[PDB]
Design a protein around this ligand. Sequence first.
Ligand SMILES: CC(C)=CCNc1ncnc2[nH]cnc12
Length: 298
Amino acid sequence: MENFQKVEKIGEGTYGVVYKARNKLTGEVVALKKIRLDTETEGVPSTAIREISLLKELNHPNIVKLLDVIHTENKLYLVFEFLHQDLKKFMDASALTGIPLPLIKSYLFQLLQGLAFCHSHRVLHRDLKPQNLLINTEGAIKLADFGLARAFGVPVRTYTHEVVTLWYRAPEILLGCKYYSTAVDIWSLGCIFAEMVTRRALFPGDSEIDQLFRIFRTLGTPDEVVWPGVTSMPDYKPSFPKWARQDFSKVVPPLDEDGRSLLSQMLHYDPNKRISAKAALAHPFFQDVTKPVPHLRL
Ligand SMILES: CC(C)=CCNc1ncnc2[nH]cnc12
């Protein structure tokens, strides 16, 4: 765009390149995202424009602010508030010592607040992953790209030919449910929570079926007792191997009883039984939550 001076390429997201750019008028550094490469023949649907415009109104201190929407030359650029680091980078940087529990608890608490806010307005993210969880020097964490999947139906091989991670995908999505709920976001967060604690991805599948079988090997193959209606799901197959559920004490050491209790509720098979963001904020796990300052050198 021309009202901005790019100052860097922050990377390549799901929808296009993300640049660090300086707004020439204001002088504020912002995150500029050019949307959808190649696949955009129509002239940018009025429908995505309308969904996006709605997001401009969704403001919360734990939601990365959508500053502007620029449909120029029949192209779309979303201007977001800029944050210096994402959680993926931070975790890689805390690989040897781990992220302290107090920090983990504060980050989870703030994430659940942003989520409860979006969920109350019937807005879903549906593509939560460490990469779109941004952190700053004050101890805050914010959810990036909330509601965009609804605007632009999420693909796997990006314009950069990159393969979209399935590691945080909820089982109802993997089994073909097309009317997914706010529960999908809680499943993803449960997975990110377990990853922060153990310093290893919970379910690093490399194909849809590998993703699903890794979930089954750990949580047990779902049946009609734990998930009523599972066997009627589109991609459900009577030929799925039947695996037993493992003990969470073995899955997420050394998380204490409160954390494991919370995690198991975030990881319920049945989307309807899964804990909501709102109820999770009330869990005993957060009784001693604080807001500590992270360790980052930019
Ligand atoms: C390309 C990508 C995966 C990196 C992280 N994204 C972001 N990085 C930095 N500032 C931002 N503001 C909005 N989104 C932001």
